[PDB]
């Protein structure tokens, strides 16, 4: 993420662009993952749990719009 400032470019804009580029690249997530060791056992369980939670939440959000509460 090589961020180079331009002529007459402010500092806050450059800092925010650098932060956004780092967040899009996703290095904090990688370093937090590599701080500990995740077993293949755990990785598969976490991935499956996240996928099923995502599918269930999207289905609930889509199907909860057909009934009112007021």
């Amino acid at each position: 993420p090589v961020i180079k400032v331009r002529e007459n470019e402010p500092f806050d804009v450059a800092l925010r662009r650098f932060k956004r580029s780092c967040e899009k690249a996703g290095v904090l997530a990688e370093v937090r993952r590599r701080e500990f060791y995740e077993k293949p056992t755990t990785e598969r369980k976490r991935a499956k749990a996240s996928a099923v939670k995502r599918h269930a939440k999207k289905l609930a959000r889509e199907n909860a719009r057909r009934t009112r509460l007021y």
């Binding site: 993420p1 500092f11 450059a14 500990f36 060791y37």
Partner: protein, 117 residues
């Protein structure tokens, strides 16, 4: 005592400390500072305020070299990642480049086990 204008600021941050090193472009370090050495110790050195105080102290230590334009190379997931750069900018330096050099291996070596707190 040597005069160099184009400088580099290496930042080594972590969850417990933050070290700032002012050097030249060839790697020869000119000055350094750390939050743990800058008064704060224990849980007070993990705050970004300690990181900015260390950055200010490092700037005051390297001011003798006469550095005007500075680039920044940050490495480490720490809260001081922004505070150090803000302090460097407020210290009158000119930030000409910002880069992240955080090492992320390609699944090379096994990391240490997980903590069961």
């Amino acid at each position: 005592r040597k005069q160099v204008s184009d400088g580099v600021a290496h930042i080594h941050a972590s969850f417990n400390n933050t070290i700032v090193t002012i050097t030249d472009r060839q790697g020869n370090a000119l000055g350094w500072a750390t939050a743990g050495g800058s008064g704060f110790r224990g849980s007070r050195k993990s705050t970004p305020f300690a990181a900015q105080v260390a950055a200010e102290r490092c700037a005051d230590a390297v001011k003798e070299y006469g550095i005007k334009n500075l680039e920044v190379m940050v490495k480490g997931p720490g809260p001081g990642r922004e505070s150090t750069i803000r302090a460097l900018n407020a210290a009158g330096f000119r930030i000409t480049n910002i880069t992240d050099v955080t090492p992320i291996p390609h699944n090379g070596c096994r990391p240490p086990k997980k903590r069961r707190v």
